[PDB]
Design a protein around this ligand. Sequence first.
Ligand code: DST
Ligand code: DST
Ligand code: DST
Ligand code: DST
Lengths: 210, 208
Amino acid sequence: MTTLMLLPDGMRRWSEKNGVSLDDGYAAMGDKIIEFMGWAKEEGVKTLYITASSAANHGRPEAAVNTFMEAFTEVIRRCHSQFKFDFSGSLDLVSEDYLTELSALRDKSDSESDFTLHYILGMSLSHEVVGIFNKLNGKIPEMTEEILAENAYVPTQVDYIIRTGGAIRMSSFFPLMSPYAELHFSPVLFPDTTRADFDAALKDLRARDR
Amino acid sequence: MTTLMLLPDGMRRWSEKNGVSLDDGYAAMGDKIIEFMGWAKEEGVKTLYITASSAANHGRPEAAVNTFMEAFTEVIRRCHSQFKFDFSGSLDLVSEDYLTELSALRDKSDSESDFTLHYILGMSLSHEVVGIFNKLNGKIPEMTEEILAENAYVPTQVDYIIRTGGAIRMSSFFPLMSPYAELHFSPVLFPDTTRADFDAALKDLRAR
Ligand SMILES: CC(C)=CCSP(=O)(O)OP(=O)(O)O
Ligand SMILES: CC(C)=CCSP(=O)(O)OP(=O)(O)O
Ligand SMILES: CC(C)=CCSP(=O)(O)OP(=O)(O)O
Ligand SMILES: CC(C)=CCSP(=O)(O)OP(=O)(O)O
């Protein structure tokens, strides 16, 4: 079954366009994620990676960081019984409070579910590689691809990547060990995404086996 | 000014469509690369990175490997005085014959040119990172972003990436230290690229 990575982009522009607070933008994002997970389950996806943040996002003022961390965490608070939950990334950039709570939510999630919802926090290839080197430096005889795969943020290969929000770039979010990922860029702001947008993405992605 | 990375794709399909040998497709690519460098030079790009091959490509049958290595090398024999030439990548996968000649051709090129043509060979993120780790393991106190950048295949940050040939994916070619590279995907087979295709690509890229 399919491994899909979702890059939810456009919450701020959506908030401004609809004349609402950024908090309401992130709440609309959380509701969309829950909706999007349901679509993914119907569509043969077994693992949904969501890029919760780039490493740079965690350098914003703490209140702004707490704002998006709280929105992503609330999704798991509401739906952790509907899937197996895990997270990974630049954990050195995340506060103790959120790491502690997300670890609790992982333990409480349905370990028997066929569907995985996995958050990647603080994505950045340079940060990822730097961290991996400094953890293993002088501790092993040689690096191999198997060892690199074991230490990478994204622990499996990604088949498809969907980026909302109109940017045609990968920013900090390219998955290190996933050379073959097919990319689909949508101009739609993430909180406006419909199932029709998702279905169009999957038809595009599926037709690449011409 | 700007740093552009080109992914030339579609030589096989172009060869079949035009009923010629794969060597002839690669010859057409070489001519197109020279033409494309002229467009790039006129449009103010100062560094043009070209992905000559993925790591996987060097696993192809060995005559096929010599075919693309020869076609890319021929470009640099022909134009190395018109730019500064350099190359990098998974050189452990490249034949020492081409590595010797390319190393000579690098030393040969116009060191004073304000335009750089740089080949990346055997590109692969995992292979790149494994190699960097194994090169520095136990020899430095700690890795930093600056040390990683000094060891990465692509030695500078990439502003724009153009991938021809219709694939909407980065395959083995994502540049490690260039998170903010803007991507442009063209459906045109590389040897079919026209100046209009290049101008449309840059217009899209410049507006972004
Ligand atoms: C979490 C995601 C998918 C995007 C947030 S990072 P961003 O909006 O800053 O991305 P860009 O820097 O704009 O490319
Ligand atoms: C989930 C995070 C942290 C950012 C995603 S949305 P954004 O802040 O980039 O919003 P805009 O792209 O600026 O509209
Ligand atoms: C040199 C370039 C840009 C592509 C050659 S590798 P390829 O044709 O096998 O491309 P894919 O890896 O299959 O996407
Ligand atoms: C430059 C190299 C080595 C491969 C790029 S062209 P290709 O062999 O992928 O040709 P096709 O895409 O298969 O038509």
